[PDB]
Amino acid sequence: PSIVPVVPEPTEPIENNISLNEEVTFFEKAKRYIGNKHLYTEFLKILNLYSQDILDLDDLVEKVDFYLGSNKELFTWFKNFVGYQEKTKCIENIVHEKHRLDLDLCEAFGPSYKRLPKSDTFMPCSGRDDMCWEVLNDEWVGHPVWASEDSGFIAHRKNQYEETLFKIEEERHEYDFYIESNLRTIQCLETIVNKIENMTENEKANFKLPPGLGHTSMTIYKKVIRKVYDKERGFEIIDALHEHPAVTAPVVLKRLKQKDEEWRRAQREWNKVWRELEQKVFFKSLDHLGLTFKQADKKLLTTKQLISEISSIKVDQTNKKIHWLTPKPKSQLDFDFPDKNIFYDILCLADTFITHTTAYSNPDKERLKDLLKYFISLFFSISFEKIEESLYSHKQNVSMSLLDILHIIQNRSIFNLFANTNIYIFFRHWTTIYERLLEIKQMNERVTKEINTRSTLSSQLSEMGLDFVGEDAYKQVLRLSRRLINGDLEHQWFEESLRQAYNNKAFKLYTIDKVTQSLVKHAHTLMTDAKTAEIMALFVKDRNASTTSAKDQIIYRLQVRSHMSNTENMFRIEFDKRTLHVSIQYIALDDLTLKEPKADEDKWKYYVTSYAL
């Protein structure tokens, strides 16, 4: 083996993977016992049902009771194999607790202090003269009564990397404890051995040292010696030098002097890992917000969650309605859109995604860009020429029937989009992005004042060109978001740049890329679910008109329901154009489609119309 160097081998597989062959017999006996093929087939049905983690253990043993309870030794074999211990308990008394407050309640003054009962349980203290007897006092005692908190909040909880740091601290403290104890025991044993060396050969044979040896906290040495030999063969030695300290403690010392050397080298070899493991984990544990929110709204911006939000508002509205107090609810979700430039800003990113994406063919990419542009312009009622000019001037300074894009109510100020799930999902994705961007923009002026007022750290952004000039900070955020979406910037640089330059008040954009990836896939599935195509068609037919009667509103609801099944629900998105107030109602099928009655005769009209068809 001289010529070739040494290589680490792949791995040795665990033990509990390759030990099975003695039990493969029992199952043939079970097959013989059950006899029939179909009963055995449902037996294997429930076995696999369990092996896929679908039902519990006790319930499994009950289903196998339904089958092989007929045989006692077989059923006990099975019971002990799966380790189903007998729940031999029908006679169980829920017993009382021993502690909480068996004894103490009397005249109580203030929130958390009560008088001690006046009894001659007087335990006398020694060191007290008259002064200490008058200033120190023992009549009142403090006992917690966690009285309801008269409030409500959430409890702080540790970031994921703080815990890694705590565990590293504890590991190295334990190494240090063991090595320091081994050294101190080396010292004591060395003193003894030196006493033993210079003697006469008969005062040796009768030498005995009592337990403790001179260590006021003696147990340590025993502990040390245990850990050096073992806890099986260690008591034997701990006693063999309690009765022969002359011949069996130049051997217990020569070995502590090996274990000290070896355990310190081991501490060094693992401090290498401890050291490489701390640069990475330390700095990303001081950002609690940007690391909590990331996972929170990675796993909460899903279909189930927002549906559950609006339906929760619905259910507590209706059960408050069951209470006589409030009359009845009008709508559920409310949105205001004060600044409309942000709309184009979202497009600033929106198709900026698609120009990079590969999961789509460029023709249908043009098609869904058409979706976005025409849809925003028709819904929020801003001119398509405005988005035209914004697009053009954008790439200047940074230098058509919609049906086949996809393929009495007078004075119409309100317009209702009665939508199924996917439309609601895509729309509130849009709404989330818009409101978070408007929030990050409102204070952009004093943000410019922040970055300028900071007059001369992280030099990287300096050479990187990732600092913040006295430029428009909000437009710079737009630019950097584009940069990371197209990949001009890996993540952590975006992160710390925004963090220090703007403030830690801009964590809600640290995921912007991902959330845009949510609206370039849902809009694409808008044009591939034909039913939603029918929905959008009926919507634009109802919206492009300027006057219609409430009977045609009911008609619209009817044959928009036509395309979605009984199981599916509907949400009505009312948009009023004067203030861009967008409200959402959670509508169940047979009940009324639109605004509740103001007076009763409008819904006399409702009655006649809805029951007329």
Instruction: Note the residues at the interface with other proteins (CB under 8 A).
Output: 2-6, 109-113, 123-128, 131-132, 134-142, 144, 146, 149, 151, 153, 155-156, 159, 162, 165-166, 169-170, 172-174, 176-177, 180, 184, 216-220, 264-265, 268, 271, 274-275, 278-279, 282, 285-290, 504
As a whole number of angstroms, the distance between CA 561 and CA 613 comes to 15
Smallest distance from other proteins to CB 142, Å: 5
Q: Residues 6 or more apart from 4 whose CB is under 8 A from it?
A: none
The nearer residue to other proteins, 33 or 140, going by C-beta atoms, is: 140
Q: Are 519 and 429 in contact (CB under 8 A)?
A: yes
The nearer residue to other proteins, 77 or 274, going by C-beta atoms, is: 274
Smallest distance from other proteins to CB 573, Å: 33
The nearer residue to other proteins, 61 or 220, going by C-beta atoms, is: 220
- Rounded to 10°, the helix 530-543/550-561 angle is 170
Smallest distance from other proteins to CB 295, Å: 16
Smallest distance from other proteins to CB 513, Å: 21
- Kindly list the distances between the CA atom of residue 354 and the CA atoms of 8, 367, 369, 523, 532, in Å, as whole numbers in the listed order: 46, 11, 9, 12, 22
The nearer residue to other proteins, 6 or 105, going by C-beta atoms, is: 6
Smallest distance from other proteins to CB 125, Å: 6
Smallest distance from other proteins to CB 502, Å: 13
What does the DSSP assignment read for 494-544? HHHHHHHHT-GGGGGGTTHHHHHTTHHHHHHHHTTSHHHHHHHHHHHHHHS
The nearer residue to other proteins, 28 or 134, going by C-beta atoms, is: 134
Residues facing 365 on adjacent strands: none
Q: Are 526 and 501 in contact (CB under 8 A)?
A: no
The nearer residue to other proteins, 140 or 607, going by C-beta atoms, is: 140
Smallest distance from other proteins to CB 180, Å: 8
Smallest distance from other proteins to CB 183, Å: 11
* Burial class of 149 by CB neighbour count within 10 A (0 to 12, 13 to 18, 19+): exposed
The nearer residue to other proteins, 261 or 389, going by C-beta atoms, is: 261
What 8-state DSSP symbol labels residue 16? G
The nearer residue to other proteins, 115 or 514, going by C-beta atoms, is: 115
Smallest distance from other proteins to CB 474, Å: 21
3-state helix, strand, coil in the chain (%, to 5): 55, 5, 40
Residue 55 phi, psi dihedral angles, 5° rounding: -125, 165
Residue 355 phi, psi dihedral angles, 5° rounding: -55, -25
Does residue 142 sit in helix, strand or coil? strand
Q: Are 159 and 292 in contact (CB under 8 A)?
A: yes
The nearer residue to other proteins, 83 or 110, going by C-beta atoms, is: 110
- Kindly list the distances between the CA atom of residue 414 and the CA atoms of 536, 551, 553, 588, 609, in Å, as whole numbers in the listed order: 17, 16, 12, 21, 21
